């Protein structure tokens, strides 16, 4: 009876915040007909997306993820 | 000799691969051809099916033309590296490679008419969902789709070469448990905003074949049901022996789907097996809380009354539910 | 006329360093699109996933004027 | 603008992918960070556990001193198959 938030995480490796900055574009991110998606354990409840700084020995990254 | 070769050598240069035939002109026309070798394995639990076939372009390039050589040449496969090609690809893909022994298995082909065909051994895991819900009774609409990465139907253009002749080889496969029953072609042209994309279809449908399961799977289910059944014909006073055989064919039903489980595909995925399985283990449960319920009555509180019934109502709602589901998934 | 432009864009322009290397970050918009989320192996905790990834950013180095 | 671009270019002309810093000087330091992003596994049978991290390496280079630019040069990572790199 168990519910999940697996997330897809991505930023830049060697080019801190003060470099590159990403950003969302539009409607955040896209999902085609979810009848065709080779999930059988799970069903898809729905998505999210999320920008933040994470902060490591190199420097301040921008981390742009998608919780599904 | 070397006529052949400084023809080739005047083809090669003046040829761009940045550039596609006829940049300025219309799309360029690709015919298409497959020549299935062998479906290695189809996967319930990954849902994927790897495919190792003889994959084959062909398309006509003006800058690509020659004369006064009738005899066709078969070049070097290096020589495609020199060569545009399309920028076909598989959507559905999950991993493909090409075989490098002994040489690179890729082949290229010039014509006197300037046409170049294109071939390649392909061993890909394509991807196609199953619908298990029926399984093992299913049958399944597995997909090769075949599309050009960046150029629009403006600029490329597939279709299959030979028409219904494009694809060959199936009668040369024999899968280890499907049955292939009949493959379709389709071309068209995914539409969306911006432009139209061609795209190609390749569909097998694949029947299951149900004999191994027939035979170790629903026959002893078939019979332990039936030996839960002799026990209302022992007499009622023997406790010991009616409550061992239903305690023990118990057993048996929960042995069987224990270690059947172990075999099928790894998919936590309610299937048809799994509803046969756990009508058989109501069965015999009933079957057992049936000597429960006599016990307590005659000994416990001319055959008795709850025995004439369940020597006749247990073989009928059997028979009964075996009809209601033969007919439901079949 | 395209591979003229072609090839006159690779002039100068290292490729070592990033769009407005001093000037300011630079602004990459992105968008993602998820053909399928593919089997949730939970016995190694993973879960497959396939994406149609486009990413857009500026670079005025890359300028050329043509039809 | 293009002051950074002739400065690295400089920077990498006449650089000696061969030799260590200080080739004829002291032994060279270098220092070491590990970031454990995870531990996938840990394998009884096969006596191994998969691993998974940032390892970044310091070391004092004076070939690669720069003046001039107030700003740490993070570069395109291909210069990595240009420059002197320990054997780690
Ligand atoms: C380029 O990299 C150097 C080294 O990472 C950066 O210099 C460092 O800047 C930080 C602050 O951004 C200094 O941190 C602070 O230092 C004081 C003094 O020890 C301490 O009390 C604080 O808790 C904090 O750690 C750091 O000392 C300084 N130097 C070093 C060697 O780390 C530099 O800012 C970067 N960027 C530029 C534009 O140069
Ligand atoms: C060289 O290849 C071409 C095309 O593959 C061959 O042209 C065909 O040849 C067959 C048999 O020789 C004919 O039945 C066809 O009518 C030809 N045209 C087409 C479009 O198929 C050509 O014959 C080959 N050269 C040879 C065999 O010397
Ligand atoms: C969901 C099934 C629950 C079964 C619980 C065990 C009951 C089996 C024994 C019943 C004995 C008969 C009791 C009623 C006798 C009577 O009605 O006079
Ligand atoms: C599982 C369904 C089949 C069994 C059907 C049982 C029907 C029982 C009918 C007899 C009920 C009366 C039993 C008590 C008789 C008495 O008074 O001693
Ligand atoms: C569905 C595939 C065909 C399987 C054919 C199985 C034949 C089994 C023969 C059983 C004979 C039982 C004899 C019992 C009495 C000795
Ligand atoms: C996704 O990001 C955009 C831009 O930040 C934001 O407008 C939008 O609300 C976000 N999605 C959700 C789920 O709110
Ligand atoms: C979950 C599958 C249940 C199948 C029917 C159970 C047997 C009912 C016999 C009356
Ligand atoms: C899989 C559907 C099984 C339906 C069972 C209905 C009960 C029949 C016996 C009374
Ligand atoms: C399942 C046995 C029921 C008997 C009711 C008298
Ligand atoms: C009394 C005998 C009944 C048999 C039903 C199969
Ligand atoms: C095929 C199912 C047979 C059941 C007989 C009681
Ligand atoms: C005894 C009846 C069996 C029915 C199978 C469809």
């Keep these: 009876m168990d519910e999940h938030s697996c997330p897809l995480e991505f930023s830049s490796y060697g080019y801190p915040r003060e470099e590159i900055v990403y950003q969302w574009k539009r409607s955040s991110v896209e999902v085609g007909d979810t009848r065709s998606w080779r999930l059988y354990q799970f069903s898809f409840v729905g998505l999210r997306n999320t920008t933040e700084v994470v902060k490591t020995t190199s420097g301040d990254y921008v981390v742009m993820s998608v919780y599904f | 000799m070397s006529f052949v070769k400084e023809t080739v050598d005047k083809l090669l240069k003046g040829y761009d691969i940045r550039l596609r035939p006829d940049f300025g002109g219309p799309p360029v026309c690709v015919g298409m051809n497959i020549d299935i070798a062998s479906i290695d394995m189809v996967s319930e639990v990954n849902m994927d099916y790897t495919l190792t076939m003889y994959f084959q372009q062909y398309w006509r390039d003006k800058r690509l033309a020659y004369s006064g050589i009738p005899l066709n040449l078969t070049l070097d496969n290096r020589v495609a590296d020199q060569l545009w090609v399309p920028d076909t690809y598989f959507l559905n893909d999950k991993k493909s490679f090409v075989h490098g022994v002994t040489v690179k298995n890729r082949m290229i082909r010039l014509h006197p008419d300037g046409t170049v065909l294109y071939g390649l051994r392909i061993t890909t895991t394509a991807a196609c969902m199953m619908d298990l819900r029926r399984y093992p009774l299913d049958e399944q609409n597995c997909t090769l789709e075949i599309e050009s990465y960046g150029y629009t139907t403006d600029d490329i253009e597939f279709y299959w070469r030979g028409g219904d002749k494009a694809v060959t080889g199936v009668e040369r496969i024999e899968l280890p448990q499907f049955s292939i029953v009949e493959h379709r072609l389709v071309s068209r042209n995914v539409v969306f905003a911006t432009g139209a994309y061609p795209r190609l279809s390749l569909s097998f449908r694949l029947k299951r074949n149900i004999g191994y399961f027939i035979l170790q799977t629903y026959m002893p289910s078939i019979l332990i049901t039936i030996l839960s059944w002799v026990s209302f014909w022992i007499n009622y006073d023997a406790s010991a022996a009616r409550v061992a055989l239903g305690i023990t064919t118990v057993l048996t039903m929960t042995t069987i789907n224990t270690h059947l489980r172990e075999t099928l595909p790894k998919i936590p995925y309610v299937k048809a097996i799994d509803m046969y399985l756990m009508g058989c283990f109501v069965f015999v449960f009933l079957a057992l809380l049936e000597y429960a319920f006599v016990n307590y009555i005659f000994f416990g509180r001319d055959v008795n009354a709850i025995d004439r019934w369940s020597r006749i109502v247990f073989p009928f709602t059997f028979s009964l539910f075996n009809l209601v589901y033969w007919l439901y998934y079949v | ?67």
Excluded at chain 3, 8 to 30: A, F, Q, S
Excluded at chain 3, 57 to 64: G, P
């Design chain 3, 1 to 67: 006329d395209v591979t003229v432009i072609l090839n006159n864009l690779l002039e100068g322009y290292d490729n070592k360093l990033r769009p407005d290397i001093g000037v300011k970050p630079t602004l990459i918009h992105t968008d993602m699109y998820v053909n399928s989320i593919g089997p949730v192996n939970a016995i190694n905790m993973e879960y497959t996933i396939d994406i149609f990834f486009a990413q857009t950013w500026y670079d005025r180095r890359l300028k050329f004027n043509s039809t």
